[PDB]
Structures are given as C-alpha cells and as structure tokens.
C-alpha cells in the first residue's frame, strides 16, 4: 500500500495541463480573514501584551484582513526592532500597506 500527497500553489495551470484527473481528491487551505482569528494568533504567539493588544483590537476589530501566517511571523519580527514606544504604529502601518486584494 502506497499513499501520495502533493503540494502546489497554482491550481489553474495544472488544470490546463490535464493533471487534476490523475489525483483522487483535493483539499483547500485558507488564509486568515477575520480580526478575531488574527487576535487569537497574536495571543497564542504572545508577542504583544495586554495594552498593545487592546489598541490593535480597536484599530483592526472593525475591518477584514487577507494575510498568510508565514507572512505574519515576518511582519512581527520586522516590527519588533523599533523602539519600545513605536512598535504598534509601525506594525499597523505595515499591515495596512501589505494590501488585501482577496
């Protein structure tokens, strides 16, 4: 008995090559798309503390988001290098600039 798993990031191209017929099924992996999910992720990672978390909540809780986890880690790391009293603003600026384009 043998099992094969395969990963990709552009389904359509494979569709054109007549390759989706070979596989037996498909599974979809989504992004983060709500403020609650983002806040939960931050809390699990624990990078930002209570007051900063509240500020971020007020800033973001009333909108929608489109980002990937592997990008989120890098954004946090980039943000952390500033001074203690500028981190939140730079993080928010980066998150705004990344752009959603769902």
């Amino acid at each position: 008995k043998l099992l094969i798993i395969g990963t990709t990031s552009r389904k359509d191209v494979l569709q054109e090559m007549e390759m989706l017929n070979a596989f037996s099924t498909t599974i979809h992996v989504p992004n983060i798309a709500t403020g609650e999910q983002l806040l939960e992720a931050l809390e699990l990672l624990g990078n930002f503390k209570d007051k900063e978390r509240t500020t971020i909540a007020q800033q973001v809780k009333g909108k929608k988001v489109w980002i990937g986890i592997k990008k989120l880690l890098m954004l946090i790391e980039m943000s952390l290098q500033m001074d203690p009293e500028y981190r939140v603003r730079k993080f928010l600026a980066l998150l705004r600039e990344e752009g959603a384009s769902p």
Binding site: M17, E18, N21
Partner: protein, 107 residues
Amino acid sequence: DRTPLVSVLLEGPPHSGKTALAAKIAEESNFPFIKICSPDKMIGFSETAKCQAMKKIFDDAYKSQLSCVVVDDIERLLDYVPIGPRFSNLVLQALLVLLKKAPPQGR
C-alpha cells in the same frame, strides 16, 4: 487470407475501463503469441529508446505464425500536452509506418 493485417481502435471518455476490455479480448483470442506494449515500462526513456523497444516487440511478433498485440494509452506513448501543443514526431512517424507493414507471407 487476402487481408493478413487488421487493426482496430478502442475509444471512449476517461475512466471508462478501455484497457481492461482490450486485455480481456486479447486473452480470449487463444492465439499462440500475445503481447502488451504499455508506456509505464519505459519511464524516463528518450525517443530513440522508445522507438527501439517498439521495433523489437514488433519483430518478435513477426517471427511467429499468427499474433495479436496491444498498444494502450497512445496519447501518453507520444508525449502530448494541450499547451503548445507539443509531442514527439519520431514516434508518430514510427507508428504510422508500422501500421501499414505486412508480415512475411502466410502469417
């Protein structure tokens, strides 16, 4: 006796079970000689290797008195792909030639 060579094509949509039926028909023939030329025994071969393998199989078939041979998944045997399109001209020419060659008399 006037037509020593005969050919037939099995066609259908995907996942229809063509290979199974072809194999069953070949088995019921009860001929002395039977052979199947599948593409999965030649993974990674270049064009010339494929040509030579097919030629060898067909010669072995020629040797005997009456024979039956199976060729399955033609579109894979010559590498086809919609984009382009692309494929191996050499194998196509080989098949087109072989389909119109009669064996030695009385066979």
